[PDB]
Amino acid sequence: RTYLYRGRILNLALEGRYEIVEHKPAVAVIALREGRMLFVRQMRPAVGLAPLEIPAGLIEPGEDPLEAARRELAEQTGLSGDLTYLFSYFVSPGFTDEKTHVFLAENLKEVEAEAIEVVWMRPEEALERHQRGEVEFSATGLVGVLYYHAFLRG
Amino acid sequence: RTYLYRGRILNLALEGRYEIVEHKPAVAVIALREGRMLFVRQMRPAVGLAPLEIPAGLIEPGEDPLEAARRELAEQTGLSGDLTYLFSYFVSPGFTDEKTHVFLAENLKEVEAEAIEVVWMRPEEALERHQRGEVEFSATGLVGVLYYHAFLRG
Ligand SMILES: Nc1ncnc2c1ncn2[C@@H]1O[C@H](COP(=O)(O)OP(=O)(O)OC[C@H]2O[C@@H](O)[C@H](O)[C@@H]2O)[C@@H](O)[C@H]1O
Ligand SMILES: Nc1ncnc2c1ncn2[C@@H]1O[C@H](COP(=O)(O)OP(=O)(O)OC[C@H]2O[C@@H](O)[C@H](O)[C@@H]2O)[C@@H](O)[C@H]1O
Ligand SMILES: [Mg+2]
Ligand SMILES: [Mg+2]
Known part of the structure; x- marks a missing residue:
């Protein structure tokens, strides 16, 4: 593997004819409260718009x-809770090694008090808005929505 | 935006301090038959292993x-069916613009007859195997599993 670039959050490598982008692993937090899911939005230069994501x-x-999940939740939403590991996935194994570890957060409590918008929204509403072409999803946002519909209802 | 590299499936650009990887959009197909989901596996150099994905x-x-979804399904599994658009998501908006359009396939029919392994597996089994640390998920594979658990049961 030969490297063509070593940057801040990614390295561009070449393994034969395969173009490979090395990327640090990530975490995502699914949190539901009073039927609303905790989404966050921020301008993403890579896509030119603000998709619906979860912390x-x-x-x-x-x-x-686990520690990263805790930090991210607090820094982006000012909250903390009891976290449980759910599962993980490679965002796009065809070219990058970025792996995302997903957690569920419960018993949320505000421990703290601008570039990231906190968006509490019922998963049902996020889905319909998306279906209407009004909002875009990041993989984390969609995973959160589907996870809710499958195991958090009732 | 200045470009540091223009490759086969990706371009590495620089937009200010933001490192941006341009990538062609993708499609994924969710297909269920007799309670089994259609997964596929192939060695992925970027991650050094074969994660569980869907076509x-x-x-x-x-x-x-829609046309790409049809082609991918046929080329990878030799099948065709009635496709319905479900939703889309950006794989990792923090650095790449890759957007994935997900479809549901029904009434599958074999229209055709080696690097890609066709893996028919009950979503419940894929989830438990993953939870056991035996198999890894690509975002498409996880989305398929969660989608099934939320809307395809019964
Ligand atoms: N990192 C890479 N760099 C260059 N060429 C690649 C790479 N990965 C695959 N290829 C080439 O592209 C062809 C595969 O084309 P596709 O039809 O797009 O299918 P595939 O790459 O297997 O799946 C595509 C999508 O699913 C995700 O797992 C993946 O992140 C990608 O977005 C193959 O013949 C292969 O030679
Ligand atoms: N493309 C980029 N290139 C360089 N630095 C970046 C980029 N995108 C964000 N950053 C820097 O990294 C910091 C953000 O760090 P994180 O805690 O990781 O949070 P965030 O980037 O907002 O979300 C990370 C994860 O969620 C996905 O949407 C995204 O694909 C990423 O894997 C910010 O202060 C910002 O300056
Ligand atoms: Mg961070
Ligand atoms: Mg193709």
């Missing part, structure tokens, strides 16, 4: 998935 | 999402 971020040096 | 691929020039 997510990169795992920092010395951090394990 | 997916890049949209080619002149192709729209």
